[PDB]
């Protein structure tokens, strides 16, 4: 792996230290860990996110390294994205997983992440908590009590993020 | 650098 490995004593110290307040890890022999990357680089109106490939190669290899099988889906639409998510909610493998990772990479605006057909005038927005809603205990009972880590690279508007101060 |  290219991730720095926990020697067995290290892990042991961590379970022996906090055992009641830690997510349980399923056995390496048998767990079926899934992760999902959705990445939009080619868009219909707005300019192509050159550089995204590196991000996909980076994250695919990491999650995999961390123990996950990785679906990568690219250049989708809020709706395609939704449908993928609902399918992801339904994968049997979750039953034998102990966590999941979803990664979204796209342009985004303040309402949420952009699907490929986004224009200024017709929005293709995936709402920040459509994503939550789709993996909650109702919609994804399989991941009840398991960590769901959602990671999002997207802009959140146009502002540069800084204010000036002096001295 | 480009913004995203």
């Amino acid at each position: 792996g290219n991730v720095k490995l926990c020697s067995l004593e290290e892990a042991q110290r961590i379970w022996k230290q906090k055992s009641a307040e830690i997510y349980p890890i399923m056995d390496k022999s048998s767990r079926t860990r899934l992760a999902l990357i959705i990445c939009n680089e080619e868009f219909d109106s707005i300019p192509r996110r050159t550089g995204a490939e590196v991000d996909i190669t980076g994250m695919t290899m990491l999650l995999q390294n961390l123990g996950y099988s990785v679906d990568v889906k690219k250049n989708l639409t809020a709706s395609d994205m939704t449908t993928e998510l609902e399918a992801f909610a339904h994968r049997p493998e979750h039953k034998t997983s102990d966590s999941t990772f979803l990664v979204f990479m796209s342009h985004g605006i303040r309402e949420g992440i952009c699907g490929k057909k986004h224009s200024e005038q017709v929005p293709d927005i995936l709402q920040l908590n459509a994503i939550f809603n789709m993996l909650n205990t109702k919609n994804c009972p399989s991941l009840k009590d398991k960590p769901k880590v959602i990671i999002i690279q997207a802009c959140r508007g146009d502002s540069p993020g800084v204010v000036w101060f002096k001295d | 650098y480009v913004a995203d």
Partner: protein, 88 residues
């Protein structure tokens, strides 16, 4: 029997920018956040739970590197430490 479960719990979301603001991407190198996130995961996945690794990525953004962003962690409902356990 049927028991009640919380409808949401055990979630965490990690965004590249704070609301209203841009985040930075580079042609030949990809996006600053994703790269930094990988670096930190590689180094810290062993010894730190996922929430402290995320914090350390925010701290890597504390001096505005010219281009500024500050990743934000959101909707946390993680009730317990999540240690990834690399090599296990």
């Amino acid at each position: 029997a049927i028991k009640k479960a919380h409808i949401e719990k055990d979630f965490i979301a990690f965004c590249s920018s704070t609301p209203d603001n841009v985040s930075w991407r580079h042609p030949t190198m990809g996006s600053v956040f994703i790269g930094r996130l990988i670096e930190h995961m590689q180094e810290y996945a062993c010894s730190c739970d996922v929430e402290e690794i995320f914090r350390k990525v925010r701290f890597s953004f504390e001096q505005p590197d010219g281009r500024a962003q500050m990743p934000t962690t959101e909707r946390v409902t993680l009730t317990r430490c999540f240690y990834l356990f690399p090599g296990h």
